[PDB]
Amino acid sequence: YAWNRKRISNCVADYSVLYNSASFSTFKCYGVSPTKLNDLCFTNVYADS
Amino acid sequence: RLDPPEAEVQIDRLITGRLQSLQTYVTQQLIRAAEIRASANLAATKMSE
């Protein structure tokens, strides 16, 4: 209910390592195929934990 | 952005829309061709007479 929010910017993201990290029980993507993430440039991202 | 099978859905949507629009345009072109051809036949008759 009090879900935290975080903003990240001004860096480069290596999604390959995170994807290869099998510790994630669920690794799902809606607007993107999990593989392609390592080849796009983005305005910014929001992470909620 | 996406993986081929998922992309195919959007591909289908957009091709349906585009083909429908362009065939409609072609139909309008056909009608305009018919009317202009009638006009041209009348003009040729007027010329010759």
Curated annotation (Swiss-Prot), chain A:
It comes from the Viruses. Changing residue 21 to F: In strain: Omicron/BA.2, Omicron/BA.2.12.1, Omicron/BA.2.75, Omicron/BA.4, Omicron/BA.5, Omicron/BQ.1.1, Omicron/XBB.1.5, Omicron/EG.5.1. Changing residue 21 to L: In strain: Omicron/BA.1. Changing residue 18 to I: In strain: Omicron/XBB.1.5, Omicron/EG.5.1. Attaches the virion to the cell membrane by interacting with host receptor, initiating the infection. The major receptor is host ACE2. When S2/S2' has been cleaved, binding to the receptor triggers direct fusion at the cell membrane. When S2/S2' has not been cleaved, binding to the receptor results in internalization of the virus by endocytosis using host TFRC and GRM2 and leading to fusion of the virion membrane with the host endosomal membrane. Alternatively, may use NRP1/NRP2 and integrin as entry receptors. Binds to host ACE2. RBD also interacts with the N-linked glycan on 'Asn-90' of ACE2. Cleavage of S generates a polybasic C-terminal sequence on S1 that binds to host Neuropilin-1 (NRP1) and Neuropilin-2 (NRP2) receptors. Interacts with host integrin alpha-5/beta-1 (ITGA5:ITGB1) and with ACE2 in complex with integrin alpha-5/beta-1 (ITGA5:ITGB1). May interact via cytoplasmic c-terminus with M protein. May interact (via N-terminus) with host bilirubin and biliverdin, thereby preventing antibody binding to the SARS-CoV-2 spike NTD via an allosteric mechanism. This is Spike protein S1. It comes from Severe acute respiratory syndrome coronavirus 2 (2019-nCoV). The gene is S. The chain holds residues 351 to 399 of 1273 of the full protein.
Swiss-Prot record, chain B:
Changing residue 45 to I: In strain: Gamma/P.1. It comes from the Viruses. Subunit of the fusion protein that is processed upon entry into the host cell. Mediates fusion of the virion and cellular membranes by functioning as a class I viral fusion protein. Contains a viral fusion peptide that is unmasked after S2 cleavage. This cleavage can occur at the cell membrane by host TMPRSS2 or during endocytosis by host CSTL. In either case, this triggers an extensive and irreversible conformational change that leads to fusion of the viral envelope with the cellular cytoplasmic membrane, releasing viral genomic RNA into the host cell cytoplasm. This is Spike protein S2'. It comes from Severe acute respiratory syndrome coronavirus 2 (2019-nCoV). The gene is S. The chain holds residues 983 to 1031 of 1273 of the full protein.
